[PDB]
Amino acid sequence: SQKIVGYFPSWGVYGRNYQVADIDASKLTHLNYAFADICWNGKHGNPSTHPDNPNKQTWNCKESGVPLQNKEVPNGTLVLGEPWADVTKSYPVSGTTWEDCDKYARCGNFGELKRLKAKYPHLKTIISVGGWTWSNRFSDMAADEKTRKVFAESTVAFLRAYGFDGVDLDWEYPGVETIPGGSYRPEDKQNFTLLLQDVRNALNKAGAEDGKQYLLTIASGASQRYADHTELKKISQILDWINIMTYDFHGGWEATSNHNAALYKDPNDPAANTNFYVDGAINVYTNEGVPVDKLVLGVPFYGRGWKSCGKENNGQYQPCKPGSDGKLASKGTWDDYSTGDTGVYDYGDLAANYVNKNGFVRYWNDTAKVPYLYNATTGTFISYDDNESMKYKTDYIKTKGLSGAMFWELSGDCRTSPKYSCSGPKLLDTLVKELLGGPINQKDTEPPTNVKNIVVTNKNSNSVQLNWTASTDNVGVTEYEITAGEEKWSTTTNSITIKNLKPNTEYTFSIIAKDAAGNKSQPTALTVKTDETATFSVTSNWGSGYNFSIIIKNNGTTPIKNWKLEFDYSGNLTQVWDSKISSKTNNHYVITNAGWNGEIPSGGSITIGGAGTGNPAELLNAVIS
Ligand SMILES: [Ca+2]
C-alpha cells in the first residue's frame, strides 16, 4: 500500500495564486501544510540577516484575533507561521461570520482544508513545522525538558483547534550550522529523539481522550552527515514514517553543474563518491538500520539552474561562472528585484517555456535516469525532473519496498498560473497512475471524536436535560445516540431532553457520536439521580478513568481554616491532590486539606484536584466544615 504526501506552501496563496480549492485531493493520501513555527522570547521567525536566510523578519506571537495565542506565549510554543493566510482571511461562500474569522481563527487556509477533507473524505492533513528558514530555534527548544513539554502540549492543542490529523517535523538540521545565528548543538542527536518521544507520548494521551490516531512524521536529510548527527534507527521506531528529502543534492551554491535529484550512481559525475543521489541516500539509511517500509521517497516538482556554465558534455558536470550580480544561480520562475537569483523553476514553467524552446535543448542521462536542459548560447544549464524520470522513481519505490512518495510542492506542477500556462501531462498523475493505479474513491472511514464534558443542565422528578461539547468529524456529525440499560434516544444536536423516567432513580447515560458513513465514537458516560458551593469539573477523560477538579467557594462571614468538604458522589474517586480522602460510605465522601490548604478566606476559593475510575457523576449535597 502506497502513499502520496503533498506539500502545500502557505505563501502560494499570494503571487503564485494557488489556493486550497484548486487542489484535487483524489490524487493524495496526505497533505502537509508548510509552515508553522516555534515561539521564543515572544517572537517567531529568523532574524538573521545573513544572505542564506531568505526571510529576515520576525513577528510577535501574541495575536488578539487568535484564541490560542491571545496571551504572552511561553518559549517552545508551536505557533502559526502567518495568521492572516492560516486562519484570518475570509473566503467567499464558506459560511463563516465576521466574528468567526475576526476573533476565533476559524477562517483562512485551515478553514479551506476542513472543506477539502469533507469533499475528499479519505484525506489526512498534517502541519509541517520549521523548514530551512524557521529551524533556528529547534535546538534551543529540544535542549530543556520544560520547553520540550511546552512544545508537545501546544502541538496537541494546535491539532485539536485547527483540525489537523498530525504533525511533521522539518528540522534542518540537527547539530549542524545551516544559517549563521541559528542554534545547533552536538546533543541535538540525543535531544531530537527525546522531543519525538515527548511529542508521541502527548499524541498518544490525546488520541485516547479524543478517539483519534494522530500521526507523527519528519522530513530528514539525505546524507551520511544527517545520519551521523541523529539516531535514525531509534526514531524510525517512534514515528509513523520519514519523509527523506532526496532532492537538492546539487544546485546554484556549487561551481560545477550537476543533478538536483539523480536516481542512480553516475561514475562520470565528479561528486559520485559523496552519494548525493537517491539510491546512495537510501543505502545510507538502510545501513543505519532504518526499515525500508518507514521511508517515503521525496521527489521534486521543480528544477535548478546555473546561469553561465561550460559547453563540454552538453553542459553536464562542467565549471560554472558567476554573473554581474556575483551569484551562480539563474533567474528562476518567481525571482524578482527583491529575491535576486535563486535558480529555482516550477516544472510548469519549464514545460511551457524551456523544454526544447527558447534555445534550450533537452538531453537525457540514461545512467542517472534524469533529464536536463542546456542553452549553448547563454550557457544556462537546468537540472529537472519530468514524467519519464518520475516513472523511473516510482519503479524504484515499488522495487526497493519504500512505502510511498512525498513531493515538493503542489503549486509547481503543470497548471495555469499568473506567469505561465502549461497544458501538458502532470507529474502528479504519473505518481497516481504508478503508485495507486488510479484516483482514490473511498468512503469516510474516520469516526467522529469522543463526547466530552457531559453536564446536567436541569433535573426533574421525571426528566433530565443533558448538554455536551460538540464532537467533530472530517465529513460531519449527523447525530448522537444515548443509551441507558434497555432504553435508547437520539438527537441531531449536542443536547437532549429525556422524559418519562422513574423518580429517585440512578441512570447511567452513555453517549456516542455518529457520521453519515456509519462510523461511531467510543461511548462516554455520566451518572445522574432523578429527584423525588463546590463545582466539580472533568479535566481529561479516557474511557476507563478521568481527571477531575473541585473549586470550593467560601460564601462565609468568617475565614475557613482546616476546612473539610463532605459530599455524596455515585462513582469511585482514586487520587486527590492538595487534599486527602478522609472516609467513604455508600458513595458519601469526606475530604480534608494538605495542611497548607487549611485557610480559605470569605469569598475565596480552594481548588483541589483528583482522578477517578469508571465514568463521572455529579458532586451533590456538598458542605464545607
Ligand atoms: Ca468521519
Residue numbers in the entry: 40 to 571, 582 to 674
What text appears in the publication on this structure?
Chitinases are secreted by many prokaryotes and eukaryotes and are utilized for hydrolysis of chitin (a homopolymer of N-acetyl-D-glucosamine, GlcNAc), a rich ubiquitous nutrient resource. Most bacterial chitinases belong to the GH 18 family (GH-18), and share a TIM-barrel fold in their catalytic subunit, have a conserved DxDxE motif, and employ a substrate-assisted catalytic mechanism. In particular, ChiA74, a chitinase synthesized by a Mexican strain of B. thuringiensis subsp. kenyae, has been shown to synergize the insecticidal activity of Cry proteins, and to generate chitin-oligosaccharides with antimicrobial activity. Our data demonstrate that this enzyme has a modular arrangement formed by four domains: (i) the catalytic region with an (α/β)8-TIM-barrel as a core structure, (ii) the chitinase insertion domain as a barrel insertion, (iii) the fibronectin type III and (iv) a chitin binding domain.
ChiA74 crystallized in space group P 1 21 1. The structure was refined to 2.26 Å resolution with a final Rwork and Rfree of 23.9% and 25.3%, respectively. Residues from the CBD showed poor electron density that may indicate its high flexibility. The catalytic region is composed of 442 residues and forms a substrate binding cleft and a semi-closed tunnel-shaped active site, with both the (α/β)8-TIM-barrel and the CID, similar to other chitinases with CID, the substrate binding groove is partially closed. Three disulfide bonds between residues C78-C100, C140-C146, and C453-C461 are located in the TIM-barrel, with an additional one formed between residues C348-C359 in the CID domain. The CID-loop 1 together with the TIM-barrel loop 2 (residues 74 to 147) assemble into a structure that partially closes the substrate binding groove. A calcium ion is highly coordinated by residues D483 and E485 (witin the FnIII linker loop), residues D512 and N513 (within the FnIII loop 2 which harbors residues 508 to 516) and D554 (within the FnIII loop 6, residues 554 to 562); these loops are the linkers between β strands of the domain, i. e. loop 2 links β strand 2 to 3, and loop 6 links β strand 6 to 7. In our structure, the FnIII-like domain is linked to the TIM-barrel through residues 476 to 484 at the opposite site of the catalytic region, defined as FnIII linker loop. Residues W137, W123, Y53, and W50 are located on the extended surface at the entrance to the catalytic cleft in ChiA74, suggesting that this chitinase works as processive chitinases towards the non-reducing end of chitin41 predominantly releasing disaccharides and also monosaccharides at +1 and +2 subsites, as it was recently observed with purified ChiA7422. In ChiA74 this motif harbors the following amino acids: D207, D209, and the catalytic E21121.
